[PDB]
Amino acid sequence: PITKEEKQKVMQEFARFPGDTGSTEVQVALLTLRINRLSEHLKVHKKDHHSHRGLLMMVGQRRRLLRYLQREDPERYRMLIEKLGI
RNA sequence: GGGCGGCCUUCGGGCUAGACGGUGGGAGAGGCUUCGGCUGGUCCACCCGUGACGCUC
Ligand SMILES: [K+]
Ligand SMILES: [Mg+2]
Ligand SMILES: [Mg+2]
Ligand SMILES: [Mg+2]
Ligand SMILES: [Mg+2]
Ligand SMILES: [Mg+2]
Ligand SMILES: [Mg+2]
Ligand SMILES: [Mg+2]
Ligand SMILES: [Mg+2]
Ligand SMILES: [Mg+2]
Ligand code: NA
Ligand code: NA
């Protein structure tokens, strides 16, 4: 579920400015937020499988944004890859 | 890794129409579950955010 007291919390942390809600960093961060939130899920339910489909999609997406931000803005890449760790 | 890709530009650099994110909706014979749930995807809107971040073996 996450909720604002989570999803907004991350954004307010990775935002590049007061109102940022879709800046690659934020996009990656909260992307890494539900990636875990679901990694944990799959454990309790090792028979789900179907949900793993998205675990993979989300993971790929997260790496594609990161590669994008690695070309256009190296500095910010190391920054972001921290506070989360790649 | 490969192949093919938006607009403008005096090529320095602009920009949003794509994609993604935020918000708010919608439908579903998704899946798993000790039945208390936990969760994947999918389609809409806006005229909010990033700014081609894409599509394809
Ligand atoms: K499915
Ligand atoms: Mg696809
Ligand atoms: Mg440019
Ligand atoms: Mg999506
Ligand atoms: Mg709803
Ligand atoms: Mg049900
Ligand atoms: Mg759901
Ligand atoms: Mg917009
Ligand atoms: Mg730029
Ligand atoms: Mg291009
Ligand atoms: Na094309
Ligand atoms: Na223009």
Please give the protein residue whose CA is closest to the C1' of the nucleotide B38: A41
Q: How far is A33 from A86, CA to CA, in rounded Å?
A: 13
Q: What is the resolution of this structure in A?
A: 2.8
Q: From the Cβ of A29, is strand B under 7 Å away?
A: no
Experimental approach taken: X-ray
- A16 SS3 class: coil
Residue A17: both structure tokens together: 């400015």
Is residue A22 within 8 Å of A10, Cβ to Cβ?
no
- Ligand 4 centroid vs A70 CA: distance in angstroms? 22
Q: How far is A31 from A35, CA to CA, in rounded Å?
A: 6
DSSP H helices, chain A, are: 4-14, 25-44, 50-72, 74-80
Is residue A77 within 8 Å of A70, Cβ to Cβ?
yes
| Domains delineated in chain A | 1-86 (1.10.287.10)
* CA separation, residue A16 to residues A1, A25, A60, A71, A78 (Å): 25, 8, 23, 18, 15
Torsion, Cα A15 A21 A23 A26, to 10 degrees, reads 60
Angle between helices A4-14 and A25-44 (to 10 degrees): 140
